[PDB]
């Protein structure tokens, strides 16, 4: 099932990559 | 080797989780 | 009780550096290779340093369920060299520990390099540490696991190119191992890349030599990324080779400032022969280039051993003197051929006089060309005006010479005061240090 | 000197010089670098004596160099020396390169829908395919699958099911894992339709395997189809199976559909089958002969009263625990007390009593008689709206002449106090069925101008259009919200919207833009909510993506706690990520956003727990906020059922919490609040039934999303707490040999018996009785293969299944 | 980490640099310089 897994750490990096940018934009939110 | 390797190039992208809990620890 | 002590500290020291490395490979990715596996080098290092009792700890490393407390006892019990080499995969397959065989193939071939044979039984550690680079090979392309091995192992392998570099040097060369270098360097185009390809670049450079400078050509084409510099001796050593490949090149100024970061970089003692041929690249382009460098600033006692040629060869540039300048080549030719400098030294024959005309330019604002030419002991002032041309040169203040009353104006740059003039002259300087703030950005990622 | 070659004109030269090339490439990387020019026009030339091996070495002078794409461009001039080299140590990669180079051309043909997709190389497909047929010939059926999709072609796709020929895992469930990871639906449907087709082409079809065209497909001719078949063959026994499996598993619509053409003997049990009907009162009958339910937890929660929100907490608790049951001993019991509740907490508390009686259906409704307001008190109007809200309540997932009458009923309803309940309970009775009418009465209700009675009016909107995609009912819901100066209609018809649009994954993003761009918060609140309902159990970026982005720009702190709700909604079908998305979240300055992250990690882990949820709610209980305590004690509850000790160390600790807080007169009224009613979800059915938004098969249970995010905008409006009632799946197990009899069936879970214990590994049941068993019993569960009744359908999980008499 | 590699290719200094510039010169030894210039 390596083709499935590839598609499986792919969404990993994915779901990261979106919740990632979340943390950034709500602590430059804290600064202000 | 295409579709066996390619997740491998994925587990690369797994260091940007570490990044994650470094910033978490800025939000707190 | 004196010999088996050394074999009971070196044993433990082993048995608690792989169950570092061992214990971190199973937990977590990135951080689980190579987190320790460079302190361990260090430590395999000083495992070198101090010191068969080796191989026979080696001997059945590991057999199935975890018994290497067991098998302390085991190796204890032995107490109480190819087919070693061979023996604990025979004896048993380990059945898992993949990261931990390559590094347990590692440790016998440094007792074989220790031995430095220089014979068959050599060659033999080498065909082991090709059983071991076998393993490398398929550590990702044939497991899919993740690079534990090529994130740790590599610099194993790394160590294995240098006993295989041994091996040749004990021959000749190995083309061939540079053409596997290349197959690592496809495996360093994948997910992950090692820098191990230049330093063996560096040696397939050596190796040609004065017969050919194309290897040094195609190395500046295969020069590619890799600015991590993690071993940071690495990027020296990269530095190293690149500065003389620019010596040879006749780019000597670019050359002086190559070798003068690589010599900061220069952690390890290098104490006997070794800082000192980095010292000796330096000082011959800076001559090259006619500034003169003295060498009490550094003066290396083991540089000075190899100095009493050069700092006569710096007093004969010093001094008018052609024959005291032969009397330095012919006495003190030999060192500096082992060095492969020679041939810098042979057109450092030709660059005396620029010296002395750097001399004037620092020295004079508007010197006289019949000066000039008492000063260079030129034998006509046509032949000093000629020298005037040569004197104008790249990198100096424009002559904007006369020719006729104003002779050899030479006029300094003026207005450089760090104001308008050099306006970009005393910002630019800013720019970069403000650019070294990077540091800021990149120690706040690590957290 | 591989210049000085090519500087003679020779042909025989210039096959001389490739071959020379390809002895030293990585010799003299840089001289093929220099002459790369040259070797460029050589490899395009058709002159030239061999372009293709000039090609060959033209991707040698790209050996140092990792550009797939020329690689691809000297496949075009290669042609089959290209294809020759199908293992070669640097060509594999180089050659695996090209295969990534296509897949993504191929995406980007599969994205195109209008057709003019750019032409694959051919030479480049050809070693594709060629490296395909090496994965067929290793018989690995993920090697196989691995270009499958990639190319996104089906014709390849039927070549990688087929394989080695071997087809046995891919015949069979290998969809259901494909549908998990797949990204596209509409590729994704044309792959679901053709692996049921090859199914259907092995000799038996499994009604499992055929299950998912049946429920994702959604077409009712191709389950009548199949079900025509089964009457063809007269196999009722297996026809029985799928139909009650078609009910459960997916929502009417479609089923309506098949039932209108199965009726259009066998005839009447298969639509009866198909109806389910007989299933909901099996559950009935399940909850009713086995409740564990503790009249003493009633009673200590009962003593301590702030005479209060206590009443409505305690009568609403007791309606969770006797859901379906019908046993009110409590109500029973207390008379005064039931008193005390004012005009309006008794008409919640009347709605309360529905929920208890929601399993009879028409016999509740006669029941109910006995409950109707001549029957009690005319006087209060409130009682009479909560009866009418009651009776949509017990009728509510059913479309019958029931739900006509209650329209009869309101049309000659109040227009307000008997509609403030009376429109909801139709609207919940009539959710889904579309009807013209029930619309009508709906807009009347919203166009009578009055916010309370319309907020009720706009949530039924929403459910009976719930999933209509109907641009008419968005529009005149949207213009009225525009135009209602109340800001309670606004938030009733800002949940009505979100349930109009429902799973439309992307039919609705430009409404749900315009939303978030309207300057209301009500409306952003609402645009929250449609990001939820379109995206209802999808991990789709671009829902979380536009939901990250509105929880910290809007400053409105109730459209930021609607966010944090919609995450979850979202995330239940993947419940492992949703806390760690949460725990930065719990912790903040709003109030709103603390309580919100404690409702949202609850609500997407459901009734399983992560263990790192459960941990992260401890402390979300102490917070010092009255209002992030209050739901961080409702959150832990919804976790805690489908729960025992065994299973979490904790469970009895927040069970101790809830009684203490109750106990407690110091702790915040408003603190306790929900801590009864937590008491109450977690006792629900009396622990029998648990909270699950998501089908065995993967499909979305559509009453268990409608009252769990209606069950959030419950702190909005107290009646919503009933929305969460519908959504209380059993964890018994149907096992009938007969749709008419009761075996006696006596499966052993041969599990620890501590998860058993609700407050020797065997399991038992007497003339199959359906009683609650964990999910995780289930999985393990034995069936009673020696005993003489024994399932035909194996017992994986727990459900309707087929069984097998000798 | 040792490079190894390369073996097969005050009160003793910093006055050094400043010997070196005249340890050709100063044969006058100053006083012949004082000498030259009564010549002069």
Same mark, same amino acid.
């Given at each position: 099932?390596?083709?499935?897994r590839?598609?499986?750490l792919?969404?990993?990096?994915?779901?990261?990559? =979106?919740?990632?940018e979340?943390?950034?934009?709500?602590?430059?939110?804290?600064?202000? | 080797?295409?579709?066996?390797?390619?997740?491998? !190039?994925?587990?690369?992208?797994?260091?940007?989780?570490?990044?994650?809990?470094?910033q978490?620890q +800025?939000?707190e | 009780? @004196?010999?088996?002590?050394?074999?009971?500290?070196?044993?433990?020291?082993?048995?608690?550096?792989?169950?570092?490395?061992?214990?971190?490979?199973?937990?977590?990715?990135?951080?689980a290779?190579?987190?320790?596996?460079?302190?361990?080098?260090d430590?395999?290092?000083?495992?070198? %340093?101090?010191?068969?009792?080796?191989?026979?700890?080696?001997?059945?490393?590991?057999?199935?369920?975890?018994?290497?407390?067991?098998?302390?006892?085991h190796?204890?019990?032995?107490?109480?060299?190819?087919?070693?080499?061979?023996?604990?995969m025979d004896?048993?397959?380990?059945?898992?520990?993949?990261? +931990?065989?390559?590094?347990?193939?590692?440790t016998?071939?440094?007792?074989?390099?220790?031995?430095?044979?220089?014979?068959?039984?050599?060659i033999?550690? #080498?065909?082991?540490?090709?059983?071991?680079?076998?393993?490398?090979?398929?550590?990702?392309?044939?497991?899919?696991?993740?690079?534990?091995?090529?994130?740790?192992?590599?610099?194993?392998?790394?160590?294995?190119?240098?006993?295989?570099?041994?091996?040749?040097?004990?021959?000749?060369?190995?083309?061939?191992?540079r053409?596997?270098?290349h197959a690592?360097?496809?495996?360093?185009?994948?997910?992950?890349?090692?820098?191990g390809?230049?330093?063996l670049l560096?040696?397939?450079?050596?190796?040609?030599?004065h017969?050919?400078?194309?290897?040094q050509?195609?190395?500046?084409?295969?020069?590619?990324?890799?600015?991590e510099?993690?071993?940071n001796?690495?990027w020296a050593?990269?530095?190293?080779?690149?500065?003389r490949?620019?010596?040879?090149?006749?780019?000597?100024?670019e050359?002086?400032?190559?070798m003068?970061?690589?010599?900061?970089k220069?952690?390890?003692?290098t104490?006997?022969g070794?800082?000192?041929?980095?010292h000796?690249?330096? %000082?011959?382009?800076?001559?090259?280039?006619?500034?003169?460098?003295?060498?009490?600033?550094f003066? !290396?006692?083991?540089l000075?051993?190899?100095?009493?040629?050069?700092?006569?060869?710096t007093?004969?540039?010093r001094?008018?003197?052609?024959?005291?300048?032969?009397?330095?080549?012919?006495?003190?030719?030999?060192?500096?051929?082992?060095?492969?400098?020679?041939?810098?030294i042979?057109?450092?024959?030709?660059?005396?006089?620029?010296?002395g005309?750097?001399?004037?330019?620092?020295?004079?604002?508007?010197?006289?060309?019949?000066?000039?030419?008492?000063?260079?002991?030129?034998?006509?002032?046509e032949?000093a005006?000629?020298?005037?041309?040569?004197?104008?040169?790249?990198?100096?203040?424009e002559?904007?010479?006369?020719?006729?009353?104003?002779?050899?104006?030479?006029?300094?740059?003026?207005?450089?005061?760090?104001?308008?003039?050099? !306006?970009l002259?005393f910002?630019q300087?800013?720019?970069?240090?403000?650019d070294?703030?990077?540091?800021?950005?990149?120690?706040?990622? $690590?957290? | 000197?591989?210049?000085?070659?090519?500087?003679?004109?020779?042909?025989?030269?210039?096959?001389?010089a490739?071959?020379?090339?390809?002895?030293?490439? *990585?010799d003299?990387?840089?001289?093929?670098?220099?002459?790369?020019? /040259?070797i460029?026009?050589?490899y395009?030339?058709?002159?030239?004596?061999?372009?293709? $091996?000039?090609?060959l070495?033209?991707?040698?002078?790209?050996?140092?160099?990792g550009?797939?794409?020329?690689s691809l461009?000297?496949?075009?001039?290669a042609?089959?020396?290209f294809?020759?080299?199908?293992?070669?140590?640097?060509?594999?990669?180089?050659?695996?390169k090209? %295969?990534?180079?296509?897949?993504?051309?191929?995406?980007?043909?599969?994205?195109?829908?209008?057709?003019?997709?750019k032409?694959?190389?051919?030479?480049?497909?050809?070693?594709?395919?060629k490296?395909?047929?090496?994965?067929?010939?290793?018989?690995?059926?993920?090697?196989?699958?691995?270009?499958?999709?990639?190319?996104?072609?089906?014709?390849?796709?039927?070549?990688?099911?087929?394989?080695?020929?071997?087809?046995?895992?891919?015949?069979?469930?290998?969809?259901?894992?494909?549908?998990s990871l797949?990204?596209?639906?509409?590729?994704? *449907?044309?792959?679901?339709?053709?692996?049921?087709?090859?199914?259907?082409?092995?000799?038996?079809?499994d009604?499992?395997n055929?299950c998912?065209?049946?429920i994702?497909?959604?077409?009712p001719?191709?389950?009548?189809?199949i079900?025509?078949?089964?009457?063809?063959?007269?196999n009722?026994?297996?026809?029985?199976?799928?139909?009650?499996?078609?009910?459960?598993?997916?929502?009417?619509?479609?089923?309506?559909?098949?039932?209108?053409?199965?009726?259009?003997?066998?005839?009447?049990?298969?639509?009866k089958?198909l109806?389910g009907?007989?299933?909901i009162?099996?559950?009935?009958?399940?909850?009713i002969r086995?409740?564990?339910?503790?009249?003493? %937890?009633?009673?200590?929660?009962?003593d301590?009263?702030?005479?209060?929100?206590?009443?409505?907490?305690?009568?609403?608790?007791?309606?969770?625990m006797?859901?379906?049951?019908?046993?009110?001993?409590?109500?029973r019991?207390?008379?005064?007390?039931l008193?005390?509740?004012?005009?309006?907490?008794?008409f919640?508390?009347?709605?309360?009593?529905?929920?208890?009686?929601?399993?009879h259906?028409?016999?509740?409704?006669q029941? #109910?008689?006995?409950?109707?307001?001549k029957?009690?008190?005319?006087?209060s109007?409130?009682?009479?709206?909560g009866?009418?809200?009651?009776?949509?309540?017990?009728?509510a997932?059913?479309?019958?002449?029931?739900?006509?009458?209650?329209?009869?009923?309101?049309?000659?309803?109040?227009?307000?106090?008997?509609?403030?309940?009376?429109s909801?309970?139709?609207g919940?009775?009539?959710?889904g069925?579309?009807?013209?009418?029930?619309?009508?009465?709906?807009?009347?209700n919203?166009?009578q101008?009055?916010?309370?009675?319309?907020?009720?009016?706009?949530?039924a909107?929403?459910? =009976?259009?719930?999933?209509?995609?109907?641009?008419?009912?968005?529009?005149?819901?949207?213009?009225?919200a525009?135009?209602?100066q109340?800001?309670?209609?606004?938030?009733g018809?800002?949940?009505?919207?979100?349930?109009?649009?429902?799973?439309?994954?992307?039919?609705?993003?430009?409404?749900?833009?315009?939303?978030?761009?309207?300057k209301?918060?009500?409306?952003?609140?609402?645009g929250?909510?449609t990001?939820?309902?379109?995206?209802?159990?999808?991990?789709?970026? /671009?829902?979380?993506?536009?939901?990250?982005?509105?929880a910290?720009?809007?400053?409105?702190?109730?459209?930021?706690?609607?966010?944090?709700?919609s995450?979850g909604?979202?995330?239940?079908?993947?419940?492992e990520?949703?806390?760690?998305?949460?725990?930065?979240?719990?912790?903040?300055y709003?109030?709103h956003?603390?309580?919100?992250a404690?409702?949202?990690?609850?609500?997407?882990?459901?009734?399983?727990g992560?263990?790192?949820?459960?941990?992260?709610?401890?402390?979300?209980?102490?917070?010092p906020?009255?209002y992030?305590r209050?739901?961080?004690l409702?959150?832990?509850?919804?976790?805690?059922?489908?729960?025992?000790?065994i299973?979490?160390?904790?469970?009895?600790?927040?069970?101790?919490?809830?009684?203490?807080?109750?106990?407690?007169?110091?702790?915040?009224?408003?603190?306790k609040?929900?801590?009864?009613?937590?008491?109450?979800?977690?006792?629900?059915?009396?622990?029998?039934?648990?909270?699950?938004?998501?089908?065995?098969?993967?499909?979305?249970?559509?009453?268990?999303?409608?009252?769990?995010? =209606?069950?959030?905008?419950?702190?909005?409006?107290?009646?919503?707490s009933?929305?969460?009632?519908?959504?209380?799946?059993?964890?018994?197990?149907?096992?009938? *040999?007969?749709?008419?009899?009761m075996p006696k069936?006596?499966?052993?879970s041969?599990?620890? @018996?501590?998860?058993?214990?609700?407050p020797?590994?065997?399991?038992?049941?007497?003339?199959?009785?359906?009683?609650?068993?964990? @999910?995780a019993?289930?999985?393990?569960?034995?069936?009673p293969?020696?005993?003489?009744?024994?399932?035909?359908?194996?017992?994986?999980?727990?459900?309707?299944?087929?069984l097998?008499?000798? | 980490?040792?490079?190894?590699?390369?073996?097969?290719?005050?009160?003793?200094?910093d006055?050094?640099?400043?010997?070196?510039?005249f340890?050709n010169?100063?044969?006058?030894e100053?006083?012949?310089?004082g000498?030259?210039?009564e010549?002069?």
């Amino acid at each position: 099932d390596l083709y499935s897994r590839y598609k499986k750490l792919q969404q990993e990096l994915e779901f990261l990559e =979106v919740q990632e940018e979340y943390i950034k934009d709500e602590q430059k939110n804290l600064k202000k | 080797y295409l579709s066996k390797i390619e997740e491998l !190039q994925l587990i690369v992208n797994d260091k940007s989780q570490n990044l994650r809990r470094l910033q978490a620890q +800025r939000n707190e | 009780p @004196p010999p088996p002590a050394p074999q009971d500290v070196e044993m433990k020291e082993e048995a608690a550096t792989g169950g570092g490395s061992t214990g971190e490979a199973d937990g977590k990715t990135a951080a689980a290779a190579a987190e320790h596996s460079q302190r361990e080098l260090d430590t395999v290092t000083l495992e070198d %340093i101090k010191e068969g009792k080796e191989p026979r700890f080696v001997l059945r490393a590991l057999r199935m369920l975890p018994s290497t407390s067991r098998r302390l006892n085991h190796y204890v019990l032995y107490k109480a060299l190819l087919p070693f080499l061979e023996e604990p995969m025979d004896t048993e397959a380990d059945l898992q520990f993949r990261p +931990r065989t390559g590094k347990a193939a590692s440790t016998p071939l440094l007792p074989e390099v220790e031995a430095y044979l220089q014979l068959l039984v050599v060659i033999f550690m #080498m065909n082991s540490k090709r059983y071991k680079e076998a393993q490398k090979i398929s550590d990702d392309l044939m497991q899919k696991i993740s690079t534990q091995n090529r994130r740790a192992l590599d610099l194993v392998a790394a160590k294995c190119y240098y006993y295989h570099a041994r091996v040749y040097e004990f021959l000749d060369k190995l083309d061939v191992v540079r053409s596997f270098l290349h197959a690592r360097l496809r495996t360093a185009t994948l997910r992950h890349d090692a820098d191990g390809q230049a330093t063996l670049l560096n040696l397939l450079l050596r190796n040609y030599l004065h017969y050919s400078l194309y290897d040094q050509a195609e190395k500046l084409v295969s020069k590619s990324v890799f600015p991590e510099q993690a071993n940071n001796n690495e990027w020296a050593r990269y530095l190293y080779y690149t500065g003389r490949i620019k010596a040879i090149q006749l780019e000597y100024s670019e050359a002086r400032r190559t070798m003068t970061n690589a010599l900061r970089k220069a952690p390890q003692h290098t104490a006997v022969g070794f800082k000192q041929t980095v010292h000796k690249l330096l %000082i011959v382009v800076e001559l090259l280039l006619g500034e003169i460098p003295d060498r009490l600033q550094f003066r !290396q006692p083991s540089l000075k051993r190899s100095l009493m040629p050069y700092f006569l060869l710096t007093q004969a540039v010093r001094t008018g003197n052609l024959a005291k300048f032969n009397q330095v080549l012919d006495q003190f030719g030999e060192k500096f051929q082992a060095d492969g400098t020679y041939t810098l030294i042979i057109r450092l024959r030709h660059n005396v006089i620029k010296t002395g005309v750097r001399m004037i330019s620092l020295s004079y604002s508007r010197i006289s060309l019949a000066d000039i030419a008492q000063k260079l002991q030129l034998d006509s002032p046509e032949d000093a005006e000629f020298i005037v041309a040569k004197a104008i040169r790249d990198g100096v203040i424009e002559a904007s010479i006369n020719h006729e009353k104003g002779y050899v104006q030479s006029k300094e740059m003026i207005d450089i005061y760090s104001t308008r003039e050099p !306006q970009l002259a005393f910002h630019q300087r800013i720019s970069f240090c403000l650019d070294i703030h990077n540091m800021s950005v990149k120690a706040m990622r $690590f957290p | 000197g591989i210049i000085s070659l090519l500087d003679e004109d020779e042909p025989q030269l210039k096959e001389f010089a490739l071959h020379k090339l390809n002895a030293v490439v *990585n010799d003299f990387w840089a001289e093929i670098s220099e002459s790369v020019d /040259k070797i460029e026009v050589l490899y395009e030339d058709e002159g030239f004596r061999s372009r293709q $091996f000039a090609a060959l070495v033209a991707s040698k002078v790209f050996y140092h160099l990792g550009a797939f794409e020329e690689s691809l461009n000297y496949a075009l001039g290669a042609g089959d020396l290209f294809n020759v080299n199908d293992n070669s140590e640097y060509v594999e990669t180089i050659i695996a390169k090209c %295969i990534d180079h296509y897949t993504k051309q191929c995406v980007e043909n599969a994205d195109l829908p209008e057709g003019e997709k750019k032409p694959i190389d051919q030479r480049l497909e050809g070693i594709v395919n060629k490296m395909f047929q090496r994965c067929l010939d290793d018989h690995k059926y993920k090697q196989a699958i691995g270009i499958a999709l990639e190319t996104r072609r089906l014709d390849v796709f039927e070549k990688t099911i087929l394989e080695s020929n071997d087809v046995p895992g891919m015949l069979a469930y290998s969809l259901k894992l494909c549908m998990s990871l797949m990204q596209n639906k509409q590729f994704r *449907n044309k792959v679901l339709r053709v692996l049921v087709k090859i199914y259907m082409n092995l000799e038996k079809p499994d009604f499992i395997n055929v299950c998912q065209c049946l429920i994702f497909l959604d077409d009712p001719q191709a389950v009548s189809d199949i079900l025509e078949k089964l009457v063809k063959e007269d196999n009722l026994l297996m026809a029985y199976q799928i139909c009650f499996d078609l009910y459960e598993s997916a929502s009417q619509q479609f089923l309506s559909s098949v039932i209108q053409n199965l009726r259009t003997d066998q005839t009447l049990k298969m639509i009866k089958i198909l109806s389910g009907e007989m299933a909901i009162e099996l559950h009935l009958q399940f909850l009713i002969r086995n409740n564990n339910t503790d009249l003493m %937890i009633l009673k200590n929660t009962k003593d301590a009263v702030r005479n209060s929100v206590c009443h409505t907490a305690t009568v609403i608790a007791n309606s969770f625990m006797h859901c379906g049951t019908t046993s009110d001993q409590f109500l029973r019991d207390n008379l005064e007390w039931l008193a005390r509740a004012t005009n309006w907490a008794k008409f919640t508390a009347t709605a309360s009593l529905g929920v208890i009686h929601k399993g009879h259906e028409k016999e509740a409704l006669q029941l #109910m008689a006995t409950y109707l307001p001549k029957d009690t008190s005319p006087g209060s109007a409130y009682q009479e709206g909560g009866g009418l809200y009651a009776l949509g309540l017990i009728h509510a997932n059913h479309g019958g002449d029931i739900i006509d009458y209650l329209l009869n009923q309101l049309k000659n309803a109040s227009n307000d106090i008997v509609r403030h309940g009376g429109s909801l309970g139709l609207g919940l009775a009539a959710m889904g069925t579309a009807r013209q009418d029930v619309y009508d009465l709906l807009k009347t209700n919203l166009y009578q101008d009055d916010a309370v009675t319309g907020e009720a009016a706009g949530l039924a909107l929403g459910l =009976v259009m719930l999933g209509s995609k109907n641009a008419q009912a968005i529009e005149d819901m949207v213009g009225y919200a525009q135009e209602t100066q109340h800001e309670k209609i606004l938030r009733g018809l800002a949940v009505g919207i979100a349930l109009v649009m429902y799973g439309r994954m992307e039919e609705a993003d430009a409404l749900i833009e315009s939303l978030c761009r309207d300057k209301d918060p009500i409306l952003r609140r609402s645009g929250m909510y449609t990001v939820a309902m379109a995206y209802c159990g999808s991990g789709n970026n /671009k829902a979380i993506r536009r939901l990250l982005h509105v929880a910290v720009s809007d400053v409105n702190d109730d459209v930021r706690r609607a966010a944090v709700e919609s995450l979850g909604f979202i995330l239940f079908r993947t419940p492992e990520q949703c806390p760690s998305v949460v725990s930065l979240l719990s912790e903040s300055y709003n109030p709103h956003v603390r309580y919100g992250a404690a409702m949202a990690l609850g609500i997407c882990c459901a009734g399983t727990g992560n263990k790192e949820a459960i941990n992260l709610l401890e402390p979300m209980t102490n917070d010092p906020v009255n209002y992030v305590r209050q739901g961080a004690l409702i959150a832990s509850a919804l976790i805690m059922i489908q729960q025992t000790e065994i299973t979490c160390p904790k469970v009895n600790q927040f069970r101790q919490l809830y009684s203490k807080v109750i106990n407690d007169k110091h702790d915040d009224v408003m603190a306790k609040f929900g801590a009864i009613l937590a008491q109450g979800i977690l006792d629900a059915g009396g622990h029998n039934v648990t909270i699950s938004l998501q089908s065995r098969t993967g499909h979305t249970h559509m009453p268990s999303v409608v009252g769990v995010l =209606v069950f959030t905008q419950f702190w909005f409006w107290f009646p919503l707490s009933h929305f969460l009632s519908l959504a209380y799946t059993p964890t018994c197990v149907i096992g009938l *040999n007969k749709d008419l009899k009761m075996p006696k069936v006596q499966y052993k879970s041969n599990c620890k @018996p501590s998860t058993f214990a609700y407050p020797t590994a065997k399991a038992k049941k007497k003339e199959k009785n359906p009683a609650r068993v964990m @999910p995780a019993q289930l999985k393990v569960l034995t069936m009673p293969e020696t005993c003489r009744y024994q399932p035909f359908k194996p017992l994986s999980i727990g459900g309707i299944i087929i069984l097998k008499d000798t | 980490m040792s490079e190894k590699k390369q073996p097969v290719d005050e009160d003793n200094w910093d006055d050094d640099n400043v010997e070196d510039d005249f340890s050709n010169q100063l044969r006058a030894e100053l006083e012949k310089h004082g000498y030259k210039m009564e010549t002069s």
